[PDB]
């Protein structure tokens, strides 16, 4: 298929955009590795996904699991051709609010692990790979009490333009997926962990979109596949953004 | 399989970016209408691409010539799924010499036409339906003595913004492709007629691009497949930009 | 203080955002130069403003109009060393409903004639000129029957771009001021002649502010000021967006 | 001396871009605090600074320094009407050869400490009053072995979108100025510790900048002090660049 002959790791790949991205990947024909941070999801995902999909339980903030996550790639698969550095998150901070860990958490996950995840991933990694970051729209506007949230996204993005420069002799092009609003348990926990108040946030987060919708996560997932396919062989550096029109009006 | 039983419009599809889309949705099932000012080279395109392509002779700056294009497909194919506003072009004036006329071509072939093609195919566009505008890097950056063109390109990128408002009622989403430098007569010319100018240019704009090269021109008709695609569905008033990471530096 | 000295000149200068520029300018102690299609409102804003400003009666879409003006600069001061091509405005149309008239009135007044406003005043410019375009936010976002008035605000702001290449050698910068909503008659001409249907649509702009108002035409005119001045030395082909959030969040 | 009456802190003022403010801004009448962390450059800078300019030496990456630093202004000084985040800087670093301790410098410096400098600064500030987050073209464009930093300046320009919103009730605004290449001890740094070395980093640095010079940093100083003034009253959340037209072409 297209992407048949390519290995393929996501981060984050047992929940929401994560999981459709390595459904969508392994759909194509990639052999896809998943990780996670909880082994009861991450092998009830590798289950759901079949297609000699692999996963790991590792945490991207650890360098230690990123060395284990990536030897067990040496080992297996012998090379790396598209990576999709998901794992991420956010949670809400009015400025006046903000801890210092609520910056630090927002900024390892988001920023740190994303820099060292790519860094580690590039003796893997062949001419002609394809790197996936995950930004978003987060990242190029503004929204009350997610400033943080705001900046590691902005940071993600503009990465993607230097990291252009450093692989150019490795041949590797690096590219941003910016998603609008998705239904994930992500997005919903924001909501709290009423049935309510996540279907209340949904619904006021699906009246933003200008088609009045969320995306469902495949809908991402065709993004991020078509980036890791050789069709974007001239794309580099560059964020494409699927928000329903949201932070393009 | 991608685009079969979707009709396809490329304006401007006998040469170049054009004829390589229309070669490239066309290998994905669609049925294309190709369009170009010289008869020869669209019956000389018409035959290479075969698979059920037809040709239609019409100037996108004649309002006539864009009503007798749809009258045709409303009498052929009768319904309309993708529409890429291709033809365009440019040429060199600096400030201070810049003529009455340079500034018309341009802008009513770049700009004003695109305009009236989207405006007279809406009619033929079902809910779903994908419009892809032909927009450049020149819209987002300074060349010396391309300002017109450069303008023009701007002026394309903000019109699909709006029409995501405005066609959001009819379900039709508006994306841009923004090449950068692409092997093409086009692009060529710009040398001037002789073989040193067009091969010292050629060279020149593959020496401005991070990854060495210019783009072949299927590699820009991948990204208008996958906008036109059921992929893009959430896709919505973006630039997707592949120039090699010229822009995004 | 910062002005005194300089000849300035602002096309469109006998209301809202080109009359308070003319004011503030002058206020500044520059020698001030407005224009105007409109005798009788002409000769009241001169009247008004006093302090030496100085107007001309004469059209931006008028090449001869734009000949005899900066004859008259040549004439009366002998340099100019401040532009500022205000004149400009936009009506409604969705997709669907676009006149070719409109295209052409919007893109010949607010694109054709910027540009020849800043060809033909090049003469009179010398090394450190400062050079002003009056864009909008709408050129960067999306309004629901406004696409071409954003498409061509678009195309001002690119235009800057490149003439920095352009303008190098003359040593005469250009940039960019962006204003959202600003409360002129302009503006309030969108809602109707009825002064209910002024306020209706007045309200409802302030709402989209993120500031909660819209701005007085002076808040637009000290960025001018503040470009016209040597403060802005270094900078460059920049859009100055004063929006109070809008276009920003 | 527009500035009169007003309260300024520069956060690292005593070289370069914070010196040049602190002058700017204490020339239009304000009471300006610097920072530093070196005593010697610290005491040198107010003497040379003279018009009622205050120091204190403290480290925006220390909490505990910046309490100090907030405490010894509300005490004297009793409020804050302008906040300039300048205190930042940057190393080279390859993808590849990029170490946890370049990551955190970096970001904790360019980042954190802004987002902190700026919540613990809020109390002190009233209605109207002007915050200023120090960025760079970096934040948006690509350069070889600056991905971190390059990174950290993006997410300072994000910081301030949704600031925006935070800040709405508290009636304070913020905006970000981007320096493109401007004469300071940090930038000549990059050059290494040899007379030679820096002075070719700097003509080759001048030689990427469209208008050829580096900027004074009285140039960008300028930049801030309008913004800190009223006649910014309508720009929020937007991004200033004085770049010499370098990341707008
Ligand atoms: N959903 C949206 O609307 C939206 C919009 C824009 C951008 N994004 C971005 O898209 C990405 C995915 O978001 P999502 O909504 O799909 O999130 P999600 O459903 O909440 O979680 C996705 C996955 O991330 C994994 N994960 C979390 N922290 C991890 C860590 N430290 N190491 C490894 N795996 C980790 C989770 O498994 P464990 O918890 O077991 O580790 C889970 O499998 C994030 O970068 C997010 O910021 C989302
Ligand atoms: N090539 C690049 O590097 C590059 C980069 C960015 C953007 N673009 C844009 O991509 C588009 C295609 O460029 P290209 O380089 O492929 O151009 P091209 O090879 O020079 O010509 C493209 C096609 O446009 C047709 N055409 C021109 N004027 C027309 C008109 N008035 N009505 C109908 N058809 C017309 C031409 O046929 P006839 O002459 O027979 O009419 C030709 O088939 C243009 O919008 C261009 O600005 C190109
Ligand atoms: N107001 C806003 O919220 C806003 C926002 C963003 C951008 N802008 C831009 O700012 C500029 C000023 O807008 P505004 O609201 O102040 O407009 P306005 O209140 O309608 O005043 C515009 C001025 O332009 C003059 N003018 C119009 N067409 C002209 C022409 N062809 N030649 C010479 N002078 C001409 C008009 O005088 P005559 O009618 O007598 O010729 C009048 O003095 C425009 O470019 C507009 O697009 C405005
Ligand atoms: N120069 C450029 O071309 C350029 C371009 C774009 C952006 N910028 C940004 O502009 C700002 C100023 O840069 P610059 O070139 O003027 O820098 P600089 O000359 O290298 O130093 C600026 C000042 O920062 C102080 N400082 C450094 N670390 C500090 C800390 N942790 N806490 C408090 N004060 C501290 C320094 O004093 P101590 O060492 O004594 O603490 C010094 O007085 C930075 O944010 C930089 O990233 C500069």
Redo the contacts with the bound molecule.
Sequence with gaps: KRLEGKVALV??????????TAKDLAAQGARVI?????QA??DQ?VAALGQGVRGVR????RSA?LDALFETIRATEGRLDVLF??????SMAALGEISEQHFDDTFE??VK?VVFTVQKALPLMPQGASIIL?????GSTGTQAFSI?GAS?AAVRALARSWVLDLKERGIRVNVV??????????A?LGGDTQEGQDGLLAY?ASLVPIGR??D?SE?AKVVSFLASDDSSFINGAEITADGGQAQV
Tied chains: 1, 2, 3, 4.
């Design positions: 981060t984050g790949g047992t929940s929401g955009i994560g999981l459709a998943i990780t996670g941070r909880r999801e991450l995902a590792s945490d991207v903030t699991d550095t998901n794992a991420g998150g956010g996950r988001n692990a995950n930004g978003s729209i987060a949230y996204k910016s998603p609008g609003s998705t239904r994930t348990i992500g997005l926990e987060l969320l995306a996560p991402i």
